[PDB]
Amino acid sequence: SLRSIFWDDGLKLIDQTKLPEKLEVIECRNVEELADAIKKLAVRGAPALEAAGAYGIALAAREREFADVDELKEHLKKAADFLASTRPTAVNLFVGIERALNAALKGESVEEVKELALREAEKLAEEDVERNRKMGEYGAELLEDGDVVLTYCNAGRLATVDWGTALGVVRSAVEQGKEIRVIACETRPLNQGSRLTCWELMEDGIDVTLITDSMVGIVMQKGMVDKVIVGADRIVRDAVFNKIGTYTVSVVAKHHNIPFYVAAPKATFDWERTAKDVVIEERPREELIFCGKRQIAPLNVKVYNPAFDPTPLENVTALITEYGVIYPPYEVNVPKVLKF
Amino acid sequence: SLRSIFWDDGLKLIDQTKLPEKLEVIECRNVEELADAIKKLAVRGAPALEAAGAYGIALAAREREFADVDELKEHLKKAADFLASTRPTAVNLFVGIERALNAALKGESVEEVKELALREAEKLAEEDVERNRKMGEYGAELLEDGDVVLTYCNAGRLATVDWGTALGVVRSAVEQGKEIRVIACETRPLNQGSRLTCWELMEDGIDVTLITDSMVGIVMQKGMVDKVIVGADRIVRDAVFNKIGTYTVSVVAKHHNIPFYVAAPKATFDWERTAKDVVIEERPREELIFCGKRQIAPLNVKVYNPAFDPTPLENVTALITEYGVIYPPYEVNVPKVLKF
């Protein structure tokens, strides 16, 4: 399969806005194109965005030819500024941008700056893949042959450079020859579960059954789920922030004594904070009013559309990271395992 | 506001297929037009279908002229058979048809048959409205000024002849002068929540905020909900069957100590059965694969689409009926309040 974003004679990305109907690889030949790809969510997922930020700098340095280095460098600082502005709050996009820029600026000739930019970006993408496979191997130990895994949103290979976090754990277990099947929640209101998760799993030959988010209750009630594995957008000392709905799934799983796992790398932890420090942004109200171009609600209806919810760590059986599986008490084990 | 189906110099019914974009009333001049309406789902809900079936017979009696009483009576039998066949599994439609036909057959002249047919249809329609007002009045006592009520699917005036069951309690409380606000779950995959519940509450001036089904968790986490009131499709000895997703709401509400009420008339109870006696039918897989005409899942994805789920009675704080509020233990109080 393809990595979600990579370099092959230029910046290439899987155009996720085209899924699930068509697999389309697009080419970003300039700063603006990548930026809009980022805006349209053609590229998404923290690692994917980090790699986008880094390849962005390699791209900006190759955009057009340069006779003088200092002019090249000046341009990179501008491009870095422009790309990060696509969303100032994207920590990963910021990390990718600054790491690639920092490295490229270390060059003393036009070629050096060009090669160093690309080399740092390729290294960062490679490290994300390695991190997910390592995390996957650790997580696979929590899966048994015949297990049915319920997941939420899309913490897979489209959201990372490759392999995935939560779905990376499923891929690692399948690789070990364990028969694993997945139940995926459609994940309203943007349907990342039906559009993306079902696509990447079917593409890779992993059994998947699609259900509405609200069906999480009946499937556990019927004993159709052995474990839940979700990803995370941010992990603070008392909670896991992930795509809205995750907390709901955690409540049903807890009541049914179903193991609930969160797969996320060390970089997703923000251990100096607690849930009270986090502000949850509201997403566009139209995501609940129209579906495709079909109006599904009165045009002027009031909408509450939070982007994420906090799942208390009390509802998390274990955290699966590239440093290993972490169990409660998290206050003790998170610092220990992540080597804070 | 308008009854969902009613008689005013001819049969008229709100075309639900047009909501929420627009309000359109269908006038049925003959039995075929009523059948078309029933078939396209312009008429919705057990009580509305029972009324549609009864009005169907009153309509068949007015459809063309009859010089002979026996010809009219035979005609009503043919019409009864045809109407029932539009939706052969619709038990309530069948019921309205049989009661209307039986009462009409008591007429001894063309004029009397026509008269008795409409009288019976009007009587059954009226009994539903009355049933819902009484239920609402008993239920309103459970609500207080400033309550925010979370609902699911659409148990309102659209799904009945008028007033509604769960939303009827909200209407009765508001008429009492209590400020009541509603939070409505969109109710996937057919979106009865956003298409119908939001429409009728907005039409009637009742505050309503729309959320996805998965947001029941955060909304309760943040204390935005004071009470939950849902309807029911069937209440057996150990469970309430209602639109899929209802059970999930009951799990979250229970964990958060939020009263969970089920409003339904006595006819919805099936006390000689238990959950294991009920088969939950699957709904068309396309409901999860497409939205409007936008593809949201891979065309060949495996889908699990149950129509309802069972909410254990242990998760229901009280049942609101036209005979009064009923509290646990239900094995004792249901037969006593419902006069079994």
UniProtKB/Swiss-Prot annotation, chains A, B:
Q: Is S-adenosyl-L-methionine one of the keywords UniProt gives this record?
A: no
Keyword annotations for this protein? Amino-acid biosynthesis, Isomerase, Methionine biosynthesis
The name this protein carries in UniProt is Putative methylthioribose-1-phosphate isomerase
MF-aspect GO terms? S-methyl-5-thioribose-1-phosphate isomerase activity
Which organism was this protein described from?
Archaeoglobus fulgidus (strain ATCC 49558 / DSM 4304 / JCM 9628 / NBRC 100126 / VC-16)
Return the broad EC class: isomerase
Please write the reaction equations for the catalytic activity of this protein: 5-(methylsulfanyl)-alpha-D-ribose 1-phosphate = 5-(methylsulfanyl)-D-ribulose 1-phosphate
Belongs to which family? Belongs to the eIF-2B alpha/beta/delta subunits family. MtnA subfamily.
Residue numbers binding substrate: R44, G45, A46, R87, Q192, N242, K243
By its UniProt entry, which SUPFAM superfamilies does this protein fall under?
A: NagB/RpiA/CoA transferase-like (SSF100950)
Q: Site Transition state stabilizer: which residues?
A: C153
Catalytic residues (positions) = D233
Matching entries from Pfam families are given as: IF-2B (PF01008)
The task this protein performs is described as: Catalyzes the interconversion of methylthioribose-1-phosphate (MTR-1-P) into methylthioribulose-1-phosphate (MTRu-1-P).
